[PDB]
C-alpha cells in the first residue's frame, strides 16, 4: 500500500510544484479537502461535479481518480484470486475485500439496470404472445381453477399465520443477545401473536391497498468460491409476505398446479430423488439393448441467469392466470423497490428479488413455463396424464405412450434440468443430418470443446467416438432451438451430454451433488458379486433380476466447499476457545457425512481430505497449547467427550490407541492395585446407508398401511403398542405421527424449497438445507458413538488418570458437575496437565519451577499461570512442615510401646522441601536399649526377617512428588530414592537403618521403603492414613485445586 502512497505524493508534487509561491501557500490547503471527497463520491458511485473549478485541474483530478480506480480494482481482483486458491491471509483482508467486491457488483448492477431502461425491453412481442398462449392452452387443458383472495374468514388463516410467525422466529432462536432493530421485529411478531385478527386485517389491507415499499438492504455471504446475496426486508411487510407465501403454496398444492416432475418435493430427500431416477432409467422397455443400433442420451444442464432475466410485466401477465389480480399486482409491486448498500441506492426493474418470502413460488411457476417450451405440450400431457387421474413421478399411462416418443424421462431441480432420451438408428441419423445441415464440420472439430468428467478412469467415462459426439451435439442443438434467447439461455460450456451406444458401455450423470455411473450387467464380466459400498444394485420391477450397477462419487464442488469450510474454521483468532473450533468441525463433518452417506466410502480423495483437515485441526490446538512442536500427543486429549472434560471430537481416520495408555491404578487399605483394560470408532459405521434405509422405509410404511387398514375395521386407534417395532424408521420417520403439531404441520406444503431458499434471507450458513426435523423426523443416531468412545478409551477410570482428578479427593465421579457448552483454555490446560506435561511429549528439554518440585517439560505459560496461582506463598514448604510436625506429634505419643527414649525433630533447611539432588533426615528416634531392624522392604510388605544388626539411631525422611501419567508409581520411586540416597557421597544420614516415606501430590499416593523395627510398621501405616485423610495443609492444596478447576459436587 506504500506504492499507492508514493504515487499520491508524486501526483501532489506534480500539482503543487507548477504553481508559484502565492498559489503554493493557498492550494496546499484547498485541494486536499475535496481531493478525498472526489474519491469518496466515485466509491459511492456519485457523479462528481463542482462549480468554480478550472478544466485542466479537473482533468488532473479525473486522471487521479481513474488511476487509483484501476489500482483499486486490480488489487481487489488479486485479493480475491489469492483467497480463492487457498492462500492464507488475515481476516480483515477478506472483510475489506468483501466490501470492495460488493461495491463493484453494485456498480455493475446499477449499470445493467440503467442499460435495460435505456435499450428497452429485450423480449419481442411475438415470443411473449407465444408463451402466453402456450400457458393459456396448458391451463385450459388441465382445468385449473384460479386461487381466490381469502375474503373475510377462510378458517385456516390462524394456522397459516402461526406457521408464518414460526418460520419468522426460527432464525432468531440461535443467540439471546440481539440488536435494537431485531428487538423491534420480535416485538412486532409478539404483537402479531397477541392479536391475530388485527394482524390478518393488516395483511389483507396491505394486499388490497399497498403498492409502495420501504428500501431493501443487501449483504453478501462470504463464500471463498462464489458470492451470494442476502436480502433484508422490513418486518411489517415481511409478515404479509410470509403469509402470502404460506397461502400460495397451500392453495397450489390442493389445486395441483405443479406437475410431479418439478423437484424438490416434500416427500423426498435428494438422494431418494437420485435413487428413483436410477430406478426409472432401469425400468424402461428394453433400455440397455443395443443390438440394432439404439442409443441412450443423458442431458444435464442449467438455465443461465434464470433469476436476473425475468421481466416483471411478463411475469404479471403470466401470473394473472392463476391468482386474483390484486395478488399478482402485489407480487409484481414488491419487486420494483430501491436496493441500498450503505451509500448506494438503485431501483430494481429487471429480474426478480430472489430473497423474498413468496419468491419460492415465482421461480417454480415461471420455470413451469420453460417445461412447455422444452418438453412440448403433447409429451407433457402424456407424462402428467389426465387431470382426473394424474400420473406418478417417472410413471406413464401405458407402455405405448411410454415408448411413443424419444423424450421419455424428464426432471427439473430448481434451475437444473435432467432429460433422458431413447433413440433408434434412423432417428439418430436424421437428427445428426439436421445438425450437420446447418453446422457443417469438415475438420472434425466437435471433439475439442466437449465437456467430460475427469474424476472417473479413462475406460469408465465416455468414449469419444465420432457418431456419439455428433449425436450429443445434435441433442443439445435440438434442445437449444426450443428456447427463445431473450427469455432463457442454455450453454454448452455449462452442460453435459452422455451417450450410451454400442461403443459406450456405461452412462454418466451429475445430480444432487452425486456423480453417478450406470453400468449394465450384460456389458461386463461374470456373476462374481463382491460387495462394495457406494455400489447400488439395480433390478427390474417385473422379473426382479439384476440388470445394472450404479457407482456413486462425490463431485468436486462439494469437496471444494468442504475444504473452504475447513479454511473458514482455521481462521479463528487467538482468543477463540478450543471447544468452538471442535464444534464447528463436528457440525461440518456431520453436514458432510449425513448427506453423502454411502458415497464417501467409494471416493478416495475425500477420504484423504478428511484426514488432512483433521490433522490440521489437531495441529491448530497443538500449536495453541505450546509453541514447540510435540513429538507425540495423546488422542485422549481430543476424543474424550465433553461431559468428562474433553472436546468430543468426531473421528474419520485410522487412529490406534497405544498400549500402556490404557492402564490405571487405585490405592486402598490393602495397598496399590493396578488394572489394565484398539481403534477409535469411526463415524461412517454408525450411519445407515441409503439403499437399506429406502427398502426399510417402504417395508415399514407398507406395514403401517396394513395395520391402519386393520385398525379402521376393528374400530381401533393405533397406539405406541403396535408401532414400537417400526420406531426410528421410514423416510419421514414414523415418529413424526406422534407430534403434538399434527394439525399444524399438516398445513405446511412446499417446505423443502423454502428451506433451500432460506439461504438468500439469513446471513449465516445453513447446513442441513435438504431437510427439516419436524417434517422428516431425525436422520442419525450418535449416542452409540459416545458410548463406544467412552468404552474404547479404557472406561471412565481409564480416562480420568490423565485428568488430574485424584488431586481433588472426590470419592466418586457421579455426584460431580461442572460450573456453567464451552470450557476455557486455562481450565482445559490445567485439567489435562498430567498428560501434556510428560517426558515423551516434549522430548529433551525439562526445567524445574522454583518453589515446587514440579518438572516442566518444555515451557507452557498457560499452565505456569495456573501453577503459580495454586502453589503461591510457599505452599510446598508448608505442606512438608505440616507432614513433619504431624508425624512428630504421632511419634510423641505411644512412647513405651516402641521402647523410644527420645524423639527429635531435625532442623529442616527451608530449601530441603524442594531440592531433589540430595536429602536429609527429618525425624530421629533414639532406642532405649537396642532395636532389631529388618531388611529394607516396602510399606505393605509383611514378609520381614530381621537381622542381628542392632542399632540405636533411627531416621525418618519425608519426600514429596508431583508426577505425570507414566511416572506416578510411588513404590518404585520411593525404593529408587532410598537406594540412591543411602548409597551416595552427597546425602547425609546419621543412621544406616531408616525409612523413606514418599507422597505424590498430583495423584495423592503414599508409600514407604526402608528398614523396620518391631511395632513401627502398623503405627506408620495408620499414622500416614490419618495424615492423608486429615492434614489441613493438604486440604488447603485440594481446595485450591478444586477452586482452580471449577469442579464442584
Amino acid at each position: 500500500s506504500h506504492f499507492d502512497l508514493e504515487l499520491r505524493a508524486a501526483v501532489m508534487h506534480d500539482i503543487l510544484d507548477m504553481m508559484p509561491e502565492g498559489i503554493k501557500q493557498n492550494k496546499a490547503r484547498t485541494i486536499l479537502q475535496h481531493l478525498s471527497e472526489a474519491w469518496r463520491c466515485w466509491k459511492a458511485n456519485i457523479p462528481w461535479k463542482v462549480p468554480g473549478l478550472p478544466t485542466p485541474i479537473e482533468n488532473m483530478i479525473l486522471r487521479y481518480v481513474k488511476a487509483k480506480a484501476d489500482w483499486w480494482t486490480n488489487t481487489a481482483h488479486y485479493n480475491r484470486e489469492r483467497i480463492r486458491r487457498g492462500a492464507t491471509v488475515d481476516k480483515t483482508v477478506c472483510k475489506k475485500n468483501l466490501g470492495r467486491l460488493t461495491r463493484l457488483y453494485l456498480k455493475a448492477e446499477q449499470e445493467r439496470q440503467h442499460n435495460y431502461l435505456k435499450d428497452g425491453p429485450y423480449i419481442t412481442a411475438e415470443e411473449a404472445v407465444a408463451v402466453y398462449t402456450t400457458t393459456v392452452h396448458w391451463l385450459e387443458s388441465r382445468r385449473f381453477s384460479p386461487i381466490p383472495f381469502p375474503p373475510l374468514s377462510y378458517k385456516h388463516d390462524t394456522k397459516l399465520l402461526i406457521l408464518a410467525l414460526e418460520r419468522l422466529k426460527e432464525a432468531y432462536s440461535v443467540k439471546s443477545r440481539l440488536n435494537q432493530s431485531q428487538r423491534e421485529e420480535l416485538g412486532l411478531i409478539e404483537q402479531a401473536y397477541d392479536n391475530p385478527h388485527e394482524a390478518l386485517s393488516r395483511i389483507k389491507r396491505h394486499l388490497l391497498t399497498q403498492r409502495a415499499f420501504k428500501e431493501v438492504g443487501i449483504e453478501f455471504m462470504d463464500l471463498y468460491s462464489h458470492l451470494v446475496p442476502v436480502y433484508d426486508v422490513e418486518p411489517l411487510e415481511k409478515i404479509t409476505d410470509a403469509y402470502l407465501d404460506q397461502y400460495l403454496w397451500y392453495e397450489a398444492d390442493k389445486r395441483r398446479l405443479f406437475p410431479p416432475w418439478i423437484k424438490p418435493a416434500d416427500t423426498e430427500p435428494p438422494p431418494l430423488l437420485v435413487y428413483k431416477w436410477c430406478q426409472g432409467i432401469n425400468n424402461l422397455q428394453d433400455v440397455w439393448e443395443t443390438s440394432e443400433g439404439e442409443c441412450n442420451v443423458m442431458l444435464e444442464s442449467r438455465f443461465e441467469k434464470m433469476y436476473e432475466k425475468i421481466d416483471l410485466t411478463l411475469l404479471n401477465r403470466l401470473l394473472r392466470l392463476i391468482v386474483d389480480h390484486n395478488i399478482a399486482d402485489y407480487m409484481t409491486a414488491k419487486n420494483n423497490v430501491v436496493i441500498n448498500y450503505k451509500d448506494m441506492n438503485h431501483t430494481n426493474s429487471y429480474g426478480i428479488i430472489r430473497g423474498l418470502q413468496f419468491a419460492s413460488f415465482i421461480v417454480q411457476y415461471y420455470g413451469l413455463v420453460m417445461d412447455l417450451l422444452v418438453l412440448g405440450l403433447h409429451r407433457a400431457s402424456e407424462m402428467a396424464g389426465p387431470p382426473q387421474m394424474p400420473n406418478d413421478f417417472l410413471s406413464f399411462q401405458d407402455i405405448a405412450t411410454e415408448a411413443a416418443h424419444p423424450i421419455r424421462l424428464f426432471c427439473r431441480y430448481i434451475d437444473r434440468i435432467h432429460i433422458f432420451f431413447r433413440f433408434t438408428a434412423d432417428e439418430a441419423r436424421d437428427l445428426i443430418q439436421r445438425y450437420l445441415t446447418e453446422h457443417p464440420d469438415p475438420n472434425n472439430e466437435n471433439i475439442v470443446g466437449y465437456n467430460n468428467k475427469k474424476c472417473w478412469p479413462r475406460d469408465a467415462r465416455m468414449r469419444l467416438m465420432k457418431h456419439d459426439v455428433n449425436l450429443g451435439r445434435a441433442v443439445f442443438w435440438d434442445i437449444k432451438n426450443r428456447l427463445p434467447r431473450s427469455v432463457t439461455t442454455v450453454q454448452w460450456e455449462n452442460s453435459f451430454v452422455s451417450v450410451y451406444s454400442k461403443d459406450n458401455p456405461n452412462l454418466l450423470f451429475n445430480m444432487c451433488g452425486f456423480e453417478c455411473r450406470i453400468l449394465p450387467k450384460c456389458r461386463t464380466s461374470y456373476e462374481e458379486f463382491t460387495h462394495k459400498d457406494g455400489v447400488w444394485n439395480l433390478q427390474n420391477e417385473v422379473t426382479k433380476e439384476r440388470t445394472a450397477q450404479c457407482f456413486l462419487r462425490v463431485d468436486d464442488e462439494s469437496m471444494q466447499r468442504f475444504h473452504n469450510r475447513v479454511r473458514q474454521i482455521l481462521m479463528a483468532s487467538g482468543s477463540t476457545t478450543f471447544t468452538k473450533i471442535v464444534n464447528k468441525w463436528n457440525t461440518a463433518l456431520i453436514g458432510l457425512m449425513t448427506y453423502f452417506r454411502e458415497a464417501v466410502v467409494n471416493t478416495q480423495e475425500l477420504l484423504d481430505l478428511l484426514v488432512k483437515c483433521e490433522n490440521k485441526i489437531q495441529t491448530r490446538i497443538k500449536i495453541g497449547l505450546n509453541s514447540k512442536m510435540p513429538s507425540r500427543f495423546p488422542p485422549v486429549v481430543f476424543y474424550t467427550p465433553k461431559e468428562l472434560g474433553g472436546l468430543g471430537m468426531l473421528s474419520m481416520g485410522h487412529v490406534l490407541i497405544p498400549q500402556s495408555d490404557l492402564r490405571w491404578s487405585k490405592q486402598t487399605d490393602v495397598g496399590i492395585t493396578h488394572f489394565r483394560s484398539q481403534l477409535i470408532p469411526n463415524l461412517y459405521r454408525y450411519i445407515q446407508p441409503w439403499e437399506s434405509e429406502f427398502i426399510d422405509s417402504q417395508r415399514v410404511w407398507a406395514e403401517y398401511a396394513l395395520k391402519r387398514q386393520e385398525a379402521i375395521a376393528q374400530n381401533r386407534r393405533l397406539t405406541l403398542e403396535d408401532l414400537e417395532d417400526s420406531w426410528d424408521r421410514g423416510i419421514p420417520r414414523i415418529n413424526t405421527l406422534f407430534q403434538k403439531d399434527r394439525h399444524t404441520l399438516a398445513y405446511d406444503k412446499g417446505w423443502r424449497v423454502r428451506t433451500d431458499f432460506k439461504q438468500y434471507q439469513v446471513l449465516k450458513q445453513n447446513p442441513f438445507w435438504w431437510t427439516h426435523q419436524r417434517h422428516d423426523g431425525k436422520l442419525w443416531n450418535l449416542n452409540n458413538y459416545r458410548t463406544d468412545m467412552i468404552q474404547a478409551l479404557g472406561g471412565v477410570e481409564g480416562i480420568l488418570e490423565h485428568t488430574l482428578f485424584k488431586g481433588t479427593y472426590f470419592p466418586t465421579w457421579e455426584g460431580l458437575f461442572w460450573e456453567k457448552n464451552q470450557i476455557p483454555n486455562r481450565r482445559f490446560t490445567l485439567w489435562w496437565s498430567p498428560t501434556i506435561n510428560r517426558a515423551n511429549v516434549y522430548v529433551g528439554f525439562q526445567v524445574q519451577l522454583d518453589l515446587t518440585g514440579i518438572f516442566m517439560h518444555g515451557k507452557i505459560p498457560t499452565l505456569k499461570i495456573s501453577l503459580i496461582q495454586i502453589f503461591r506463598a510457599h505452599l510446598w514448604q508448608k505442606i512438608h512442615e505440616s507432614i513433619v510436625m504431624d508425624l512428630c506429634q504421632v511419634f510423641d505419643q505411644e512412647l513405651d510401646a516402641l521402647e523410644i527414649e527420645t524423639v527429635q525433630k531435625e532442623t529442616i533447611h527451608p530449601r530441603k522441601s524442594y531440592k531433589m539432588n540430595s536429602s536429609c533426615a527429618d525425624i530421629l528416634l533414639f532406642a532405649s536399649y537396642k532395636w532389631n531392624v529388618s531388611r529394607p522392604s516396602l510399606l505393605a510388605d509383611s514378609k520381614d526377617v530381621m537381622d542381628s544388626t542392632t542399632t540405636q539411631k533411627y531416621w525418618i525422611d519425608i519426600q514429596l512428588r508431583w508426577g505425570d501419567y507414566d511416572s506416578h508409581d510411588i513404590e518404585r520411586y520411593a525404593r529408587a530414592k532410598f537406594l540412591d540416597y543411602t548409597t551416595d557421597n552427597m546425602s547425609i544420614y546419621p543412621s544406616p537403618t531408616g525409612v523413606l516415606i514418599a507422597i505424590d501430590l498430583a495423584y495423592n499416593l503414599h508409600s514407604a521403603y526402608g528398614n523396620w523395627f518391631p511395632g513401627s510398621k502398623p503405627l506408620i501405616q495408620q499414622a500416614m492414613a490419618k495424615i492423608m485423610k486429615a492434614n489441613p495443609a493438604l486440604y488447603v492444596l485440594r481446595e485450591r485445586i478444586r477452586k482452580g478447576l471449577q469442579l464442584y459436587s
Binding site: 460387495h531 459400498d533 452417506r597 454411502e598 466410502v601 478416495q604 477420504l607 484423504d608 484426514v611 483433521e614 490433522n615 489437531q618 513429538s631 507425540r632 500427543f633 495423546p634 488422542p635 474419520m652 481416520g653 485410522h654 487412529v655 490406534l656 497405544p658 470408532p681 469411526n682 461412517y684 459405521r685 454408525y686 450411519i687 445407515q688 446407508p689 437399506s692 405406541l720 408401532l723 414400537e724 420406531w727 426410528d728 424408521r729 443416531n781 449416542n783 452409540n784 463406544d788
Partner: peptide
C-alpha cells in the same frame, strides 16, 4: 503412533457401513 491420524484407504476389509448401528426404544 505419534498421533498422526491415518487415511481409511484400503483399511476396510470386514467392516461394512450398517454394522454396529443401533436404534432407540420408544421413550415411555
Amino acid at each position: 503412533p505419534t498421533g498422526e491420524v491415518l487415511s481409511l484407504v484400503g483399511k476396510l476389509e470386514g467392516t461394512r457401513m450398517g454394522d454396529k448401528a443401533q436404534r432407540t426404544k420408544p421413550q415411555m
